[PDB]
Design a protein around this ligand. Sequence first.
Ligand SMILES: CCc1ccccc1C(=O)Nc1n[nH]c2c(C)c(F)c(C3C(C#N)=C(C)N(C)C(C)=C3C#N)cc12
Ligand SMILES: [Mg+2]
Ligand SMILES: [Mg+2]
Length: 267
Amino acid sequence: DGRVKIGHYVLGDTLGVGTFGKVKIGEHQLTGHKVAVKILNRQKIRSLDVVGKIKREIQNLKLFRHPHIIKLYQVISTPTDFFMVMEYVSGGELFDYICKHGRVEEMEARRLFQQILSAVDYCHRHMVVHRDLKPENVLLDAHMNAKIADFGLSNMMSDGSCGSPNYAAPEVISGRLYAGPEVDIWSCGVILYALLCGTLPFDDEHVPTLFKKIRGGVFYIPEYLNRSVATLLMHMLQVDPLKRATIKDIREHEWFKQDLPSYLFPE
Ligand SMILES: CCc1ccccc1C(=O)Nc1n[nH]c2c(C)c(F)c(C3C(C#N)=C(C)N(C)C(C)=C3C#N)cc12
Ligand SMILES: [Mg+2]
Ligand SMILES: [Mg+2]
């Protein structure tokens, strides 16, 4: 041979090095279809005692059907590794696009936020969340569609933006021993803000003062911003998660409902 071939795919460049192993671009030997293969070292899995958990994150992610969540095609099992054959998307990180292009048009921001909000709702409904939404893990494809890695502990990948603690919800910063789905609402509020303004709502070069602005919850609403989406942002970026907007609140908002495609929320 001479090449690392698993199943029908020949592995090539390394897209990133993560927890249980590297992620490499795969290429179907017969069709040429590009693919992203997560390599899960089984000895690493057994050292963390998450064997029964990973096999249920995989078996659960295998039953995921969402156009804006990274799809799992198949899992190939060798005695030493798990090979998760997953969708490859070449558009790069969403926030890398924003930090290089600036704000997008309001219709493009609405289309992308509706895709992201639908994927987040699908994960909260169809899986046991081991991760929270990382806005750095929001990818794009070649058609400018949002692609999200599921919230399982297998997707701890980010190797290979305008800040990093900027996407940390207040209850996460305060070390609250419990956190629910409202943490992802905050992150989506950060995402929506960057889509409409071109920057992050709480950005600060000094990290301690960055945490202070997040706890204060004061962010600059530009006057050019739509007055309706301003109310949505204020509701999503509430410091107190009890007063923070929910998915049903965002789904009912007049700005979110405009030109909403039918396939996103079949519920
Ligand atoms: C954003 C870089 C990039 C830039 C330009 C072109 C392609 C990529 C890229 O890599 N695309 C991915 N396609 N399919 C992936 C899967 C299944 C992953 F699993 C990951 C994995 C990963 C790695 N390596 C990275 C870089 N990130 C941030 C995330 C969210 C991953 C996860 N989970 C990437 C792609
Ligand atoms: Mg002070
Ligand atoms: Mg204003």
